[PDB]
Paper text:
The S-layer Deinoxanthin-binding complex (SDBC), one of the main units of the characteristic multilayered cell envelope of this bacterium, protects against environmental stressors and allows exchanges with the environment. The SDBC is shown to be both a photoprotective system, through the xanthophyll-binding subunit DR_2577, and a chemoprotective one, by the SOD activity of the subunit DR_0644.
The atomic structure of the SDBC core was recently described showing its β-barrel organization consisting of a massive three-pores region inclusive of its ligands and cofactors (the xanthophyll carotenoid deinoxanthin, two exclusive phosphoglycolipids, the metals cations Cu2+ and Fe2+). The trimer surrounds the coiled-coil region of the SDBC, and each DR_0644 monomer is localized under the interface between two DR_2577 pores where the specific cofactors, a deinoxanthin molecule and two characteristic phosphoglycolipids, are localized. In particular, the Leu53 of each DR_0644 monomer appears to be in close proximity with the deinoxanthin molecule of each DR_2577 monomer. As a result, each DR_0644 monomer interacts with the interface of two DR_2577 pores through their respective carotenoids, via the N-terminal region in one interface (Leu6- Ala19) and the Leu53 in the other. Furthermore, the collar region was also modeled and identified as the protein DR_0644, confirming previous characterizations by mass spectrometry and a previous model where the only carbon backbone was partially assigned. The identification of the SOD subunit implies that the SDBC exploits the photoprotection given by its core, the protein DR_2577, to prevent damages that are otherwise repaired by its SOD chemoprotective component, the protein DR_0644.
Numbering used by the authors:
A (entry chain C): 342 to 389
B (entry chain C): 245 to 292
C (entry chain A): 245 to 1167
D (entry chain B): 390 to 487
E (entry chain C): 1120 to 1167
F (entry chain L): 20 to 79, 142 to 201
G (entry chain I): 156 to 201
H (entry chain I): 53 to 79
Amino acid sequence: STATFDGLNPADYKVPTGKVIDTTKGRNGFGFNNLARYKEGSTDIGIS
Amino acid sequence: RIAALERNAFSVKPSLTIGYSVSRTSRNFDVDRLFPLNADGTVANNAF
Amino acid sequence: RIAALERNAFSVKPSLTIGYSVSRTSRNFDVDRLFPLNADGTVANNAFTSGGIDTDTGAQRRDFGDFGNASDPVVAGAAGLYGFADGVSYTVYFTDGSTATFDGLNPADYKVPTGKVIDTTKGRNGFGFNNLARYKEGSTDIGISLGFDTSGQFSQVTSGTGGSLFSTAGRLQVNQIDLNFGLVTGLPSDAYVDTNGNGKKDDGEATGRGTYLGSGGTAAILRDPAGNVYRPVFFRFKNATTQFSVGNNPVIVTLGQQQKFYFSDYVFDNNYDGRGDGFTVTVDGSNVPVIGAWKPQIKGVYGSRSGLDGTAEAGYGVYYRGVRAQITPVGTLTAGIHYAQEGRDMFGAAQNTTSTPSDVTTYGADLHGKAFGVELHSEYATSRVRPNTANAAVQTSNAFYARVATRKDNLAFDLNTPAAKFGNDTFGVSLYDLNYRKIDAGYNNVAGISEYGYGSYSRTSAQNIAYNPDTGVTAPFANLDRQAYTDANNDGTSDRNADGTVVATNTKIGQMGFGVKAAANLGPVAIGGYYDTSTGANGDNANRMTEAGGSAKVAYSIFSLRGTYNTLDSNRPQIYRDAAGTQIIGDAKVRRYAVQADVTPGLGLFVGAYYRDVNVNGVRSTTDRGLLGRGYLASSFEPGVGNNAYRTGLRCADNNFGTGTRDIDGVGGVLNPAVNLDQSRTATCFTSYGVEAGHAGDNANALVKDLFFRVGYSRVYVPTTATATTGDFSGSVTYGDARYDRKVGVANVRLAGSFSTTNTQLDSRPAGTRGAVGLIVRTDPLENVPFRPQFNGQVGYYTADNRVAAGNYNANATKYGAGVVLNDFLLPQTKIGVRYDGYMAQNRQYTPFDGDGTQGYFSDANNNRRTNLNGVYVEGAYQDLIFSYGTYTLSQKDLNGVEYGSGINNGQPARGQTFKISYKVNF
Amino acid sequence: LGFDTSGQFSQVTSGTGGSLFSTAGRLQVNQIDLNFGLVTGLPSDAYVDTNGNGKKDDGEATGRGTYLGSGGTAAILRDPAGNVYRPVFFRFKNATTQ
Amino acid sequence: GAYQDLIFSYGTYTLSQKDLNGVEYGSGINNGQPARGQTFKISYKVNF
Amino acid sequence: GPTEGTYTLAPQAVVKPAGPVYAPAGTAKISETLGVTRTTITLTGMAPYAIYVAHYHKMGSDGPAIMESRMIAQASADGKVTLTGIVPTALIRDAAYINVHHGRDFSGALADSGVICTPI
Amino acid sequence: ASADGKVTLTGIVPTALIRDAAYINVHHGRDFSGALADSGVICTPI
Amino acid sequence: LGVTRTTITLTGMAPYAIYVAHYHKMG
Ligand SMILES: CCCCCCCCCCCCCCCNC(=O)[C@H](CO[C@H]1O[C@@H](CO)[C@@H](O)[C@@H](O)[C@@H]1NC(=O)CC)OP(=O)(O)OC[C@H](COC(=O)CCCCCCCCC)OC(=O)CCCCCCC
Ligand SMILES: CCCCCCCCCCCCCCCCCC(=O)N[C@@H]1[C@H](OC[C@H](OP(=O)(O)OC[C@H](COC(C)=O)OC(C)=O)C(=O)NCCCCC)O[C@@H](CO)[C@@H](O)[C@H]1O
Ligand SMILES: CC1C(O)C[C@@H](O)C(C)(C)[C@@H]1CC[C@@H](C)CCC[C@H](C)CCCC[C@H](C)CCC[C@H](C)CCC[C@H](C)CCCC(C)(C)O
Ligand SMILES: [Cu+2]
Ligand SMILES: [Cu+2]
Ligand SMILES: [Cu+2]
Ligand SMILES: [Fe+3]
Ligand SMILES: [Fe+3]
């Protein structure tokens, strides 16, 4: 399972649930949600 | 007779939307706080 | 008000289909090969055909069975009745419960058990047998459908006001759209739910009829105990419009998807598909006060490749831009420059994969037109490709050509029109082509930002030409590549394909060279010549291919005498067969010279004598191996007075025989009204000499009006054994053809005939006698005899004594068919009709379509088998109710008489029977 | 809501046919008994006949269960604004078979 | 810009939040670069 | 330089029509076979869009009409109706004139009482 | 023509095609697909 | 520049009729 921590310092994630343990899967168990958004250029025709 | 025909006739309404869009950002901030505020307090319209 | 009501009203269109059908077969053979062929080559319509005519894959009505509800295609080889029926197709069982299908008459030859599967003895011995019998239990079907069409008056749109910093007026532009929509009750069998967006049906996407139960088919029907049937209603529509244009006089802006544009060849040949989604602006300055007589024009393109598409696609985060500017300072000479660029953005530089260059920036100029009695066509390009990766090391590649020749409207260069004309008919020196080429090695469709192209279209035909009509690659000259033996896995021997053809590795070398083709028109004389040398881009003579030649013609009165000399010197590898007959790669030298004299008395007759001498690699070379066709300037002359045209292409099919061994009908084409056997040539240049008389019926003042025959004799050179330098003109060919339509009375006769007494194997025709004759009669309705009968008829005999290195076998065929239609039978509007067809064949076979453009054909095989296809077809009709009945039998025996038809091996032929009652009704 | 038709589609005219020949066409006029219209919602006894017997076998489909929102109270295709959507079906019954 | 009724909208914006030192925390992957946003639209309203 | 001219328009005086001239005319082809009669009345110059019921009126002009002969059809955009009908001969025995009429409905009805009639 | 006879006609045409036109005639129609019913209900020079 | 938009606004016409208007040449 995974959760989302809303903060600039993952070390302050003071809310691990009852039985969950941080697995060192990302950097040190904490990933990083990409802050970049993209809208690839396209022309859209919608018909109704 | 024409009124009787028109009473239970369908008006066909087709809609077509055409448009091109591209957008690239790295943090997704807000820009509506830069635009002028109208006399009714609403912010000026923009395409973004 | 009535018009307003009609504008947005529905037209209710109900459809009802009524019909009874029963069909019983035991092998599911084909019967469309018995029916007459129409003058356009199509087979006559019948009520038993399964259909299946596909032009993409070459399928025809003769490639599929016609009985039951199954359209099982005919199978080549012994599994099928040598292309006459359906395959045997045993079934193989496995240990894990899985099964496979083996297509063969002997399951023991199932040499393909998968890695872990073992044949479980569940069937006979682990092999089942797929039943070859198809049944259509007799039933009468009523099909009911309903649709709602619209008035079709919604073909326009008007723009509306928009803008944020301002507000446009609105109602300024009217756009014509191509939207076709309506209401349907039920879904087509080919509908699907596209969950990916690719627009194509992936592996089992949805089967839309299975998503909406009760839409169509018989698997699901939404019913009611009262008998009501419910079907969902769908809104169906097609949008064929993807481009919207704004502005009228000077400036026009087009927005849309998959924009198609074209700056020039080598830069933005991006039409025929388009590149992506965006806009294009065109500014026309043909009405400007100061400079408008030069017709200045500007084009500008912006877009995103393929629109939005998922990562790993070449067009992810890739955008293109460009601008071109052109004018016409003189009569028709248009000069233009253009900038083009395509690149990745920050979201394409990362997380795109593929190999699209990080950047491409091409500049170019072109000078196409016709100004002062001459036609110029020039082009320059520079690529500057940025090859992604990390170091990149930007690579430059140019493409320049300058040609004095005539380009057609489709942008293909017409080398038969001079474009110089330095004189009149009495003294008429004409320049046909004068070109230079400097295409670089690295210039491909990526260098100049195009969809396809910039490579030899054939590599066997004119291989310096990149013009590709299939992919719309309009480019005069191609990026040549060097070919060599592969030797991939094995070592010591060059890699070959299954058929024996070589496997080659192609390395792009580019192209650089020049070429001139010209002709001088004397009076009763004419001369012409051509020269062409192309090397690689670097200029190394290891890739040179020079073709030079020249011809001279003298025509006076009714006599013409031509003499042609052709050469080809290719240090460039070239793939071709040697004397023995094995494909090889290696330089070639071809020297040909032909002196051919013709006489035309003028009564529709013609005579022709010729002596052509080929010389490949220094040896006399009985037949050239297609090498002379590697150049695009061949330019032979043509017989006749006042015909001094220097047309490209060595007319090697002149006054020589045909080598065809395939035919649509059972007999060798003599029964096909769409094939003229007297106009069949081989198109191969031989070392031979001979004569050929003839007669043409289309030419006026001819002995017989519609009569054509092509009697001819020839002698062909053949080396001593296989590759000896010495040889003799020992081969001999005597051929003859005839064709005579005529219309005696109310009947319409048609006779065709062919003969051949070849001594050697020329192209694919074996060495032996070959004859064929065919007669077709079609009487129009007789209004004197009662019943207004209308007869038909068809007879065809074919014989061939194939003396191949493995036998001396005879392959003959006999096709016949008669039928009478009574147009007035007892009660009013009552018709009766009967047709009996038959086809017997000795060692012949049918090869079905290959799934590509190639179609199936009847050929000769040494299979010791005799086929006896037969059938009778009775079609009667009351007022408009049609009763069709058909009984057919297919038996394929061997020399002993084992009767392999109906391949359960019980000595019985395959049989098919059908009965239909048809009734077309309209609301 | 239902949509009835004018009921003027009670005739069919034959069309030309044949392969060895071609019949004149427009020779016979047949009176049919097709009653059709448009419905918005399915009845309670509707079902999906997956076998062709024309009868409801053991729990065939319960057509109201196949098309949710067609009828009943178990399913209702709604909208937060309060709009209610019901699929439109083309209902028809053909009493002519000869 | 707007031709008859086709509207071309382009917009480039930059958001940089520095501290007293000048660390430029914008675009918080901590690479000393501001957040950036660019948009391009072509709009065309059509009616039947 | 938007050269603009504003002109008031005059109400005209000549408003003659433009389209099909109602000039009824045509022919009939009654063809007997084996006890059945097929009648084809091709008319031109008729009303542009109108239903044209035609039946066989018996002698008596007034007279009853053997309504088992009603041929119904509508016209095109130039005024071309093609009436076609199948009637037993024994039915049309003692008929006098094929009278074409106007149709108030596609179900029949005699809006007009004889816009064109042919003696049979 | 709306509902009280408020017909508002509009249209674009290259001036080159217009040349030699002398009067803009307004006619009645038989349908929205062009066609001519009345031959000149209102008209003006130029 | 080179195109001509023409707005013929008519009033007191027939309630729901079609009004096709074009440019008739000198003849
Ligand atoms: C009337 C409208 C007035 C104009 C409205 C305001 C726009 C101008 C203001 C500056 C705004 C334009 C400034 C130029 C940005 N540059 C672009 O061209 C990029 C190209 O993408 C990518 O390409 C790669 C290789 O190609 C690389 O370079 C990448 O690095 C790059 N991607 C990136 O990382 C993003 C920078 O397109 P974009 O995604 O930004 O798309 C939008 C652009 C810009 O929009 C326009 O202004 C076009 C208006 C034309 C109307 C023509 C119709 C006239 C009608 C009479 O559109 C183009 O294509 C044009 C290219 C620039 C030329 C501009 C001059 C006419
Ligand atoms: C009628 C009018 C129609 C309007 C539509 C047409 C629009 C025409 C636009 C013409 C603009 C001038 C083109 C200058 C050509 C310079 C010659 C040229 O293309 N250089 C090549 C290439 O260049 C890279 C490019 O340069 P560039 O200056 O083009 O882009 C800057 C700017 C884009 O802004 C945005 C949105 O970020 O565009 C402009 C000019 O506004 C760039 O910096 N992008 C960074 C990313 C690098 C990868 C593309 O670098 C090398 C290869 O990596 C090498 O191969 C060079 O040869
Ligand atoms: C200004 C204005 C205004 O405000 C009010 C009112 O006047 C208007 C609205 C009309 C208006 C708008 C005016 C508007 C319409 C713009 C004018 C139209 C022209 C068209 C624009 C482009 C002109 C440039 C021209 C096209 C370039 C010419 C260069 C050639 C291409 C060079 C080719 C040479 C080649 C390389 C040689 C071959 C070499 C090789 C080796 C290849 O062989
Ligand atoms: Cu078939
Ligand atoms: Cu893309
Ligand atoms: Cu192209
Ligand atoms: Fe898909
Ligand atoms: Fe059932």
